A paper describes a structure:
Cellulose is synthesized by [name] (CesA), a membrane-integrated processive family-2 glycosyltransferase. The enzyme synthesizes cellulose from UDP-activated glucose (UDP-Glc) and translocates the polymer across the plasma membrane through a channel formed by its own membrane-spanning segment. While bacterial CesAs primarily function as monomeric enzymes, structural analyses of plant CesAs revealed their assembly into triangular-shaped trimeric complexes of three catalytically active subunits. Cryo-EM analyses of all three CesA isoforms reveal the formation of homotrimeric complexes, similar to the secondary cell wall CesAs.
Of note, compared to GmCesA1 and GmCesA3, the yield of trimeric GmCesA6 was more variable, with some preparations producing primarily monomeric species. This suggests that GmCesA6 is less stable in a detergent-solubilized state compared with the other isoforms. The helix has been modeled for GmCesA1 and GmCesA6, while its density is detectable at a similar position but too discontinuous for modeling in the GmCesA3 map. The displacement of TM helix 7 away from the TM channel of the neighboring subunit opens a lateral lipid-exposed window in the neighboring subunit’s channel architecture. About midway across the membrane, the opening is roughly 6 Å wide, for example between the side chains of Ile901 in TM helix 4 and Trp1018 in TM helix 6. The triangular PCR arrangement in a CesA complex positions the side chains of conserved Lys and Arg residues towards the threefold symmetry axis. These residues include Arg449, Lys452, and Arg453 in GmCesA6 and coordinate unidentified ligand(s) on the membrane distal and proximal side of the PCR triangle. Inactivation could be due to modification of a conserved cysteine residue in CesA’s catalytic pocket (such as Cys558 or Cys630 in GmCesA6). In contrast, the activities of GmCesA1 and GmCesA6 peak at pH 8, with a slight decline at pH 9. GmCesA1’s apparent IC50 for UDP is about 0.8 mM, whereas this concentration is increased to about 1.3–1.5 mM for GmCesA6 and GmCesA3, respectively.
Author numbering:
A (entry chain A): 249 to 645, 713 to 951, 972 to 1059
B (entry chain B): 406 to 539
C (entry chain D): 945 to 951, 972 to 1059
Write the structure that this text describes.
């Protein structure tokens, strides 16, 4: 049929008019880089040989990093989806829906650190998605086993009864009440229903009362009672001890249950808390996700799993349909491991002082990855296929064995064999809660492959990268869905401390992956993994190692300003021409990067600032911790990470002052290369300006101990450099 | 008269600040740290009452802009003693406090006293210092 | 007047962008010629650049829109402007 032959989606290669010059000047800049290195190596500095050697090592490292970064971006593409064809094929009006089932996972660890209002908003947004109510289920994992989360979910389930029909009737976007009622956009735009105003006022008042109720619940649960927590029916709370409690599973909505305001049903909401016992490693988020996968397979057994963070809400209600446009395709859907959505955040400054938007990565590197094998699974907002998580190869590219791979639960083994999802027919519905409690036992993952070859992979802080790499080495492919309206939105870090800690955590995870047996350099040699994807994985693994060449280079001018030497033997016409050509090539290549990627100058400029800041601050301590773990067994706002950048900044300032005094006030005459000498320090201080702005400005603050340490280290370094 | 409604609301709901104009013009989320189940309805009612109070104050200001021909007169027919700014006897009035009138909760309110010191021609009143001493 | 022919309209921005990039190229070339190579008695270059600054000061919004956000032009008009600027520069250098 003509309708059946029309694809549900199609790829849009970057038009040749914008991709041919990109490749041309990539090759050209490679040529000038090689010529520049040939010039630099063969002409050293006689009286400053050590400085020349350090500098040439630094640019060699920089060029290697640039090559490894630029190579994956050879073939960027875009992807376009058609929801009307999906409706024609699977969601035809009148006929029953043929869409596949969906499970959406949310994970929370502490109601004190993560306010229950945000989790309630996320749950409300998920429950109001534009999907059949019987084909979508929501699972919430609570690692803290706190009754506050249970009561917040119980109240959110009662508010959903009123919120979901309103959104479905009036096409409200976004479905999260907090972000919808706080929007400055005209809410009467494109609204045609005659009863919009009264119902909107009523639902706003109801939401305000719900917020007050949630605040009261939070206030009441602030202090633990003497005899532990108790429920509303007199029974004590099983999760009184955070580190010692049995597994708990509760169902709030769905089949049977209770209907909503319009009389229809609502998506099933399940509260799951895995068993915790002393002396057992729970593996934190990876173990929680594995337990959620097992529970969802036991109860609902949807064939696709949505990973949503607690602070991320479904902004676009059509995200599930867009995911199914790829995942339900008869040909591509078999070979797809997951669908990845871009990460967007709200509440960010207009200038994005901390580069929280991160436009450069998600709009250049992700698109380049999508053109070879698929984006790397990062963060949240990912639609995984169950068959990929089970350690199976791509279809289109032995009971004892099953018990050795999945576990000792035969119901889960039976559920794993359902291609289209759903509860297996040869399974009693009455005995389903007991098996779901069994699969979250602390000792279930014994002598099995969970966390090693199937599910989320342990052994690293950033388990997402490891899971994506393990799926990709099997030969699976991934897509990078980029909807017109962003599918998911979250909350950006407020101050610099949280961003620095997050960058340090990412770098530590990358280092741990590098030192483990799952390194892309020497793992995955089966032929399934593509060469360019392997290079991208290596680049994402050994990126923090570029901290050492950075921290030396930023310290190069100040030493020059405190010793009297230059890295260039003598300024010549040939050398000046080579330097100018290299700078022009770099600037032009960046220009076409913006042109094809659609990124403004401000965003990429501040992204470069933040990249330099991160490499100088967090990656250095990441490498220090890695070396300490290699050579020993020691380990650690954290007032130590800011010591290197501030020390280097004031070293550069002192060196600038000393050089100006020495070569102008006293010497003068033929000052010489002092113009570029000061320009280099100006570049360094510009790249590290935000630290000085925070230290000297407002809305910040640094303890005196770290400042004293930095000043003492700077004075010691300056005295040693002057003496030697 | 507006105090008899404003004060119990603030004391019950721990409203900060207590000035209605600055409280109702705050961009901070007013639902933060509020646990009472009847906060929204009472806040809406008190906001409407404060708007009506502002309208009444505006009407009073507009009415008193122009002095009448025979001087000012009170609401009971007696003339205003302070017709002349530089020549009037001292006036003391008590509005709230002990006895008086209770609020919407049945409790009393802090005493409010209106004091106007005597002014006569040829006498130096010393302005704010004299007013404070009086 | 002379015929009977007649016509975002991506032609109106061709003259200003072409003239702006011509001024930028001329500034760069003059700085290279009269400072990097010649130096000595550069002469009235302080005025010669300054006048050009005036132009780039007055036509700054076009550059801000082209390089900034909340704007954008197709590749065809940029290619036409670059080609016209290169042709004009080559003709001026040759003559």
């Amino acid at each position: 049929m003509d309708e059946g032959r029309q694809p549900l989606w199609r790829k849009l290669p970057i038009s040749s008019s914008r991709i041919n010059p990109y490749r041309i000047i990539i090759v050209l800049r490679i040529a000038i880089l090689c010529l520049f290195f040939h010039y630099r190596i063969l002409h050293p500095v006689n009286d400053a040989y050590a400085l020349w050697l350090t500098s040439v090592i630094c640019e060699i490292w920089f060029a290697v990093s640039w090559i490894f970064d630029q190579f994956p971006k050879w073939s960027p593409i875009l992807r376009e989806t058609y929801l009307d064809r999906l409706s024609l094929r699977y969601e035809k009006e009148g006929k029953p829906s043929l869409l596949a089932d969906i499970d959406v996972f949310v994970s929370t660890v502490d109601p004190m650190k993560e306010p229950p209002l945000i989790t309630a908003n996320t749950v409300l947004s998920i429950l109001a998605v534009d999907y059949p109510v019987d084909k979508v289920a929501c699972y919430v994992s609570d690692d803290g086993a706190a009754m506050l989360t249970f009561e917040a979910l119980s109240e959110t389930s009662e508010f959903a009864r009123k919120w979901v029909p309103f959104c479905k009737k009036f096409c409200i976007e976004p479905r999260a009440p907090e972000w919808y009622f706080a929007q400055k956009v005209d809410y009467l735009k494109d609204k045609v229903d005659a009863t919009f105003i009264r119902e909107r006022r009523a639902i706003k008042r109801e939401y305000e009362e719900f917020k007050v109720r949630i605040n009261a619940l939070v206030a009441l649960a602030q202090k633990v009672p003497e005899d532990g927590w108790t429920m509303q029916d007199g029974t004590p709370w099983p999760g009184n001890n955070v580190r010692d409690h049995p597994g708990m599973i509760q169902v709030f909505l769905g089949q049977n249950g209770v209907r909503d305001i319009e009389g229809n049903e609502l998506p099933r909401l399940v509260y799951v808390s895995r068993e915790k016992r002393p002396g057992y490693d729970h593996h934190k988020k990876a173990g929680a996700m594995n337990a959620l996968v097992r529970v969802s397979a036991i109860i609902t057994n949807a064939p696709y799993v949505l990973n949503v963070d607690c602070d991320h809400y479904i902004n676009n209600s059509k995200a599930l349909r867009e995911a199914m446009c790829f995942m339900m395709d008869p040909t591509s859907g078999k070979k797809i491991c997951y669908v990845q959505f871009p990460q967007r955040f709200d509440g960010i400054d207009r200038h994005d002082r901390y580069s929280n938007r991160n436009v450069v990565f998600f709009d250049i590197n992700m698109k380049g990855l999508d053109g070879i094998q698929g984006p790397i699974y990062v963060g949240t907002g990912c639609v995984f296929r169950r068959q990929a998580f089970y350690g199976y190869d791509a279809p289109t590219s032995s009971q004892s064995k099953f018990e050795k791979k999945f576990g000792q639960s035969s119901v889960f083994i039976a559920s794993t064999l359902l291609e289209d999802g759903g509860v297996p027919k040869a399974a009693s519905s009455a005995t389903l809660l007991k098996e779901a409690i069994h699969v979250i036992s602390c000792g279930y993952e014994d002598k099995t492959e969970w966390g090693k070859e199937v599910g989320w992979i342990y052994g690293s802080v950033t388990e997402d990268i490891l899971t994506g790499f393990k799926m990709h080495c099997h030969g699976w492919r991934s897509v990078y869905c980029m909807p017109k309206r962003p599918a998911f939105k979250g909350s950006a870090p407020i101050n610099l401390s949280d961003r620095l800690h997050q960058v340090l955590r990412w770098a530590l995870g990358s280092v741990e992956i590098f030192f483990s047996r799952h390194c892309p350099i020497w793992y995955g040699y089966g032929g399934g993994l593509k060469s360019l994807e392997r290079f991208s994985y290596i680049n994402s693994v050994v990126y923090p190692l570029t901290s050492i060449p950075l921290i030396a280079y930023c310290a190069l001018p100040a030493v020059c300003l405190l010793t009297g030497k230059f890295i260039v033997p003598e300024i010549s016409n040939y050398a000046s021409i080579i330097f100018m050509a290299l700078f022009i090539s770099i600037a032009a290549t960046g220009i076409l990067e913006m042109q094809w990627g659609g990124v403004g100058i401000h965003d990429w400029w501040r992204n470069e600032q933040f990249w330099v800041i991160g490499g100088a601050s967090s990656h250095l301590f990441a490498l220090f911790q890695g070396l300490l773990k290699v050579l020993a067994g020691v380990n650690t706002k954290w007032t130590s990470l800011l010591i290197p950048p501030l020390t280097l900044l004031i070293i550069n300032i002192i060196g600038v002052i000393v050089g100006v005094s020495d070569a102008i006030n006293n010497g003068y005459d033929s000052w010489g290369p002092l113009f570029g000498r000061l320009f280099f320090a100006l570049w360094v201080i510009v790249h590290l300006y935000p630290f000085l702005k925070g230290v000297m400005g407002k809305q910040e603050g640094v303890p005196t101990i770290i400042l004293v340490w930095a000043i003492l280290l700077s004075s010691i370094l300056t005295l040693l450099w002057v003496r030697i």
